[PDB]
Amino acid sequence: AVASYDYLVIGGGSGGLASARRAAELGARAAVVESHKLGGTCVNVGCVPKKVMWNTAVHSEFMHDHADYGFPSCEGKFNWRVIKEKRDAYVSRLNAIYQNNLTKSHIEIIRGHAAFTSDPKPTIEVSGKKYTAPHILIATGGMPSTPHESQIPGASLGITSDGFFQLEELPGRSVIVGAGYIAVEMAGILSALGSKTSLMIRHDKVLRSFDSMISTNCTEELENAGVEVLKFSQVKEVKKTLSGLEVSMVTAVPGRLPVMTMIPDVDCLLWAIGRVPNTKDLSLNKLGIQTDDKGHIIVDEFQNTNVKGIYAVGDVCGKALLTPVAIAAGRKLAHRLFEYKEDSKLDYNNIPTVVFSHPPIGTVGLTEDEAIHKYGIENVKTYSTSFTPMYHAVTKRKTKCVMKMVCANKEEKVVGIHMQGLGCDEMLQGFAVAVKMGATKADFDNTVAIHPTSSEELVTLR
């Protein structure tokens, strides 16, 4: 037998939950399939527990300042287990909330692993039972990438961000491999909490896809905080030693000769080199659903797959791997399908990003280089500043704030904002609304400053 629904959602993570909830508001008869824990990567091994750990790291960094601010010196060893237990409890509270959200919406929860069948009419099977709908959303997310043994023997001795959230103790010595935001965030947390930490990157700077100013500044701030940034460096092999691991590294700096270095006594080797979509076991071939060579589901601007009645959103499609993106694309899809809003879709331009470095980074819109390519060098003007936030007026430890505004054409439309500094995590959202509305430099000029803040600097550039 086959049970029929209006909407079947494969994956109860960010995008799948949001899409199902909105569809149900519109009257859809919906079900969500989930093999593991509701909330997906973000709630269980992603955004949420990362932010708890970031808050813990931030707290610790600020307490280096406690004597400078007039208090007796707060000399203590962090106890990883204290926070791990509390973090885990918060994730459990959230799992229970998301289950209840589906129940309140009368969305059926199908527990298990879905795969498509060969029925010409798109149908899935879960635990030997079949389900069909005229609309099936694939929202299965991804997973961390790990090197192949054939390429890096011993790579399996490292962990990923998934394993980071299983750690029960602070590693004494950590080596994080990668240069993107996950690598940066993990390295910064581990180092702030007291691990002797290295960050191994293929080139000279982290975050090379971000604006050059952010890439530069973030690299400098990492080093100033005590993270050893191992530049032009790659892992060749990993071996188990009596103490932890030995990492064999090759370093090849331009203008120098290549050199092999052993890194001994590593407790935590964390691969943060990419994400792979969760599609291998879906039986996509049974319906001819199109993927790229990496396994991402191919979609159009409306989240359609190449197969009528089948859609995909979120990390499984490989574009803008963020929770709010999955959510927004999933909601827009629900209005298209169940409110018949044929133009309902997510605009993937001007999505804002925060990176929870120390201090945090915020960005929205085009890098200076992207703007130059799009508009022409003669038609781009940038404004920027660098300062030490007044928080540090009384401290011996310092962090900087850098800000860049990228403007296009005669009217100086603000096409990008890029910053790193205290408060930038909470500062960005409102500026992203302005950018999405097409604000010009004059619109920023026209807004009275709030003093004393860091944020006022973005409305007083000249």
Next chain:
Amino acid sequence: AVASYDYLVIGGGSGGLASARRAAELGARAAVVESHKLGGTCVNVGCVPKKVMWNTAVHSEFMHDHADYGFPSCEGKFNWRVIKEKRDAYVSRLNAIYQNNLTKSHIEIIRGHAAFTSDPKPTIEVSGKKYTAPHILIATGGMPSTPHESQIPGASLGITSDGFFQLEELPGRSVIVGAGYIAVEMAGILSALGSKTSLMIRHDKVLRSFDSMISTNCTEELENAGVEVLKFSQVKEVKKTLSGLEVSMVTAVPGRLPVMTMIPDVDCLLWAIGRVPNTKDLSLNKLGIQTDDKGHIIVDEFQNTNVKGIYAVGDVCGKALLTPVAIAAGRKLAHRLFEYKEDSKLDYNNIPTVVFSHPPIGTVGLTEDEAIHKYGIENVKTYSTSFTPMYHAVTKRKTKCVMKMVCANKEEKVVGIHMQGLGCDEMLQGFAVAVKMGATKADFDNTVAIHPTSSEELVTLR
């Protein structure tokens, strides 16, 4: 003899410095008169040292959380003198910078107290020497209000915010009188740093000119933090006692009878009841320059006084008593006068405000009640939320975040944003740019969220 300039600025504070600097860029032959310290109230006894003290208070509040975040308990007595010395040094560094800014701009600094003369041609005298210009800006600011002895005998035994910045030790027991932002900020700082603190207010809540949600929430947060809010209470008399002061208070709660209470053993009684403009000794009458009954200089929308060639900006005019307002009005005036931009003026609508409470408050635009009066009840819709920031997921101490969006007309133009919560100090600026541009609820709807932040809540209201 009389020396002639294009522009004479009386007062080297926020507005006067900014206006003189901009005028000099345009070629004006300018001079600034300053009787005390460059930077005025903000730098010396206002925004800047207040923010240092707020950062000190904030630090302390967060350290109540140190054990909850996995560290050994940071049990220490604050040392007021440590931070006072550092605060003072920062103010001195800023005094030196503002002096140098005038020197680099070739703006003459005239040290002393200016007053107008009776010369039909507007002229000032400073230390027996006369100066004239076709354009004279009055930017003399204000000072704290104190009660008259005839009304409150012993009032002179209290201090004001000026005296707060002279304190060399933490008062054991503090009573702050007032209900506006200065009173709120002082009470919150003193209490966070360990003073046994009361805040005495005439009605039931603080910040009654702010949106009702902020007034309510701010009052509750003060009480939850240990500030004793003495409602419907006024000082009748103050007397010196062997220990500190005794404050005689009358309390008259609606529905109850009036009662007299003595508050003994008060170390610091701080009057934060208002500001008075600094005009008494200017000899305004010699030129017939118009003032209100409180001594504020009357101006039009272009900062003109009633006398040709004489202008006023900033706190001396009694409207929107903020540093960025003085600065912006002063710059706009310089472009009007010296760039001949006849429409150059400051729009006093949609000026954003932060109050450095615990947690901070941000507001821009109309309160819900203001919007209802302007647009009609049928044409206003509000959206709001309340939550506990995830920072507190792991702590026993709690603070809330409240947010309100006030929308007008069919298009739901965003005419007000009001919030209190962690991060709100740095969150507001960008939203103020959006409001100034006429953002609608759809424009907020259209902006992808940044997760996990508090700020995302303002773009996900429903």
